[PDB]
Design a protein around this ligand. Structure first.
Ligand SMILES: NC(=O)c1ccc[n+]([C@@H]2O[C@H](COP(=O)([O-])OP(=O)(O)OC[C@H]3O[C@@H](n4cnc5c(N)ncnc54)[C@H](O)[C@@H]3O)[C@@H](O)[C@H]2O)c1
Ligand SMILES: NC(=O)c1ccc[n+]([C@@H]2O[C@H](COP(=O)([O-])OP(=O)(O)OC[C@H]3O[C@@H](n4cnc5c(N)ncnc54)[C@H](O)[C@@H]3O)[C@@H](O)[C@H]2O)c1
Ligand SMILES: NC(=O)c1ccc[n+]([C@@H]2O[C@H](COP(=O)([O-])OP(=O)(O)OC[C@H]3O[C@@H](n4cnc5c(N)ncnc54)[C@H](O)[C@@H]3O)[C@@H](O)[C@H]2O)c1
Ligand SMILES: NC(=O)c1ccc[n+]([C@@H]2O[C@H](COP(=O)([O-])OP(=O)(O)OC[C@H]3O[C@@H](n4cnc5c(N)ncnc54)[C@H](O)[C@@H]3O)[C@@H](O)[C@H]2O)c1
Lengths: 256, 256, 256, 256
């Protein structure tokens, strides 16, 4: 078990990658904080994860927090220190991807995605990093960006820069927090059959073409990101910081 | 001269890389629109540059437009429309780098760098692209990103995401704009001796440290970015889009 | 323990990164095949390592196989077949780095680095992959590339192409082997204090220069590469293939 | 005109990218050396280029040289110094790509591609770089690698590592030759409708699918690489070394 006493903050853990990451952390011994949207969907799924975690002997807390609200980071660590006394791992997973054309992009739609995926993340890692610094025992930070941090997307001109900015954030934060033992890394998932990609997969017309492009012959599911995220949060990656890791089943390298 | 018919909009052309790029384009026959801060230090530099190219057979205006103000997009478009009739090349260069440590980064200063380097660039590219599509004659977009789009900066945790997002924006835009003949590329300059780093480089015991890391043996000057920017804006790059071009004297590869 | 049933072939496991990786896999329950130089300095290290893991409940043999000799592929396969019955994980680690300047690089020494690090790796991966396909149970390939696969080295113009080709080989192999359940990934270690750079790091006035470039504040040790190699070889990386994993303490991103 | 006195060595310039690069160099004032395979195809096409160059007032020489023959580099510079007195630019374009499956790759087929695309290139850049060094006036080196230096290819496990090795070579050579003004860069063309891709395009079944993936809406032709190569050889790129440049019409960023 890899996080036997580390307490892990996972944002946007209602469903998708964030949910499966928080669950596997508890299975490795972590004391998870299940952050969510503060919506009733977020509140319900988080309790479900919290209830499922204690079902096999784990412990966790559900805390609502809007990633666009720049005060959510310090509230999430404040809930984590009040509940478990320390902040050791931050999985900044919260984000949105509203597909939209570029030349007619609304200013509000763009600024809501930059604030949620980038700006809100910047102050969640900041509030978390501070706690790891004055704790003096190090820590791990994992940002969930995208394969789109390395390529483009015609309907994601407002999305891919936030994901490439999350990667770059982990690169610079790796330098600023390096001397304090705080390693910062990014996971770049490929096509994960989640709710963000539901509108495309609900067509089931090019899902067969989506799967065709993945060399592993299948789409990703949230538990594909659980293993890599807890690896980056563990002592198995003690010398890993400023790195990205593609979790895409070969999608990136498979040129056609 | 490789920009004869073209009309070029260069943001942040009052000083630094933007000035040299706007100067070299006009010597290649271009009709330049040197946007600037709206400052009178920026207006004088633009007007001086305008007079400079006026002295040997070039054309240029000067349009004060705050990049943090997203209306500046349609402002610089209409100004290049109402004086030159077309917009054929956009060089998005306006950017700030206020060196500051990560854990005590003010919200105000961080939003000021995101809005000035990324948000204002998105809608500046969007506004310029809408004109290129409406004309139906193709075009070229060039974003001045940075070597910091591939590596980190301890005092630039607020800065490197904007440049990395500038890169990713060029990638996603090259897809959405490709079918319309609009090429979008990023130039990645290394350490260039400008006023973005005048104080940062006046250590006088650390400048030569950065200088010894450049295999070419010298720091950059804004004229070194002029050649690569006109090339990417020229027909020499007819099949070049969605690409990045390191102009760093070998700094990135020099694993010193 | 995450490699219970698996059988691991580790080239160049007599010393350095290969030894630590072969040691950690067996503590994860693996049946290790520590290939070595055929040297008696390599045989003793392998036999010592074999006895080391034999001391706390592990299994291992020792197979002398020159990586420059491309028959060594089918040799290490048959040796793992004729003793353990299967080959499930291949860690291609054997490599030389004979520091030498570019313009006076002998043909013999250059071909010796290409053949040992790349050519012998290609057919070692090919031979191991043929067994994984014939079994039809999937598998994992892990190539020890380098941070030098993304940056340059003035005294490694013969060395960095082999590591960059090792990266690209993992990408192309992840496509051809993906449908057969065979994942192929590269680990990119930074500056690791081994005997590949004992003389290069004994300047004693340049070691701390490289050390100050690592944000984590220390050079690597072979045990730092053990965690990432077993992870990529484990089911934690079920959806990870064609990926690279920087293990450098932040060296790559630290634009010092 | 960008190379008004520079003398340019282009290898494998019979047809394809190498031919169109040598021709555009002459149109920019260069004194070209048209290297070719030494076959009768190579001899014929080279004379045709040489005859076509002098048709518009240029000057050039045809020289046969096998890239697999490691002595071809010094012979190519020896012919260039005997003909024009200096070596200033080296476009190492020679290479092959025999498509073949991985698990049944012949040792001879692999070693002939590593020797032609990588090993032969390493000593062609070496012989050329030496001349630029003792000339003391600098120079430019351009290696034609591939988009496959960044991705994979199922039928190119023997090909993509040589192309990624060519990139890495330019990165390390940029460091070793930096202090001597010798800039080394790589072009990464995408899908160029040449003879290497003829067997796929002669099917014309997925050529329509090949074009579908390119955002510029068309395949590449050799003159798409002429502009970028002469840019990298000119004073427009005086601060550009250790860089790669994608010339693919957006193919790399267009994820599907
Ligand atoms: N869909 C993919 O395949 C894919 C690929 C690469 C990266 N990502 C990224 O992974 C992350 C998870 O997305 P997903 O695939 O699990 O789909 P998802 O719809 O399940 O989103 C995951 C979580 O983000 C939460 N969230 C959204 N906005 C929030 C806000 N302001 N505050 C707090 N929580 C918020 C949601 O409530 C949800 O729980 C995203 O950031 C996404 O950009 C997804
Ligand atoms: N010089 C370097 O080392 C370096 C390295 C990497 C990237 N860059 C980038 O190069 C680009 C060129 O700038 P520079 O740093 O070379 O010279 P500079 O810093 O001296 O001037 C930057 C320009 O940006 C303009 N500008 C600043 N804020 C603006 C605003 N709100 N609205 C409109 N215009 C504004 C200014 O008018 C100015 O001319 C920058 O965007 C920078 O991010 C520079
Ligand atoms: N230590 C570093 O700084 C560093 C950095 C980047 C990459 N690497 C790579 O890590 C890998 C591990 O080696 P190391 O350098 O860490 O330790 P090392 O240099 O002390 O030993 C290298 C291993 O390779 C084996 N080997 C060498 N030549 C061989 C041959 N012809 N045939 C069979 N085996 C042979 C040796 O038995 C030895 O155990 C190397 O391949 C190296 O390219 C190391
Ligand atoms: N086909 C593509 O789209 C593509 C994409 C990326 C990179 N490349 C690379 O560009 C280069 C040019 O290939 P191409 O697309 O023009 O097709 P091509 O068939 O025309 O090959 C170009 C030249 O390479 C020459 N050549 C081959 N082997 C040689 C040898 N031993 N010695 C001397 N010359 C030799 C050939 O005679 C030919 O003139 C190649 O190295 C290729 O790997 C091609």
């Amino acid at each position: 078990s890899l996080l036997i006493d580390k307490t892990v903050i996972v944002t946007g853990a209602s469903r998708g990658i964030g949910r499966a990451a928080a669950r596997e952390c508890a299975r490795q011994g972590a004391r998870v904080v299940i952050g969510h949207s503060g919506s009733d969907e977020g509140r319900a799924g988080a309790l479900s994860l919290a209830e499922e975690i204690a079902a096999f002997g784990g412990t966790a807390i559900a805390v609502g927090a809007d990633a666009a609200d720049l005060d959510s980071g310090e509230k999430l660590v404040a809930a984590a220190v009040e509940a478990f006394g320390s902040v050791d791992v931050l999985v900044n997973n919260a984000g949105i991807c509203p597909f939209h054309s570029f030349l007619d992009m609304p200013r509000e739609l763009y600024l809501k995605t930059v604030g949620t995926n980038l700006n809100g993340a910047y102050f969640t890692v900041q509030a978390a990093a501070r706690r790891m610094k004055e704790q003096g025992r190090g820590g791990a930070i994992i940002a969930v960006s995208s394969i789109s941090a390395l390529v483009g997307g015609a309907m994601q001109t407002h999305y891919t820069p936030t994901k490439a900015g999350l990667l770059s954030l982990m690169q610079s934060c790796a330098i600023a927090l390096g001397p304090y033992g705080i390693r910062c890394n990014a996971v770049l998932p490929g096509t994960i059959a989640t709710d963000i990609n539901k509108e495309d997969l609900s067509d089931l017309e090019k899902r067969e073409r989506m799967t065709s492009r993945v060399p592993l012959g299948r789409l990703g599911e949230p538990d594909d990101l659980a293993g890599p995220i807890v690896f980056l949060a563990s002592d198995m990656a003690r010398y890993v910081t400023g790195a990205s890791l593609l979790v895409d089943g070969g999608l990136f390298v498979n040129l056609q």
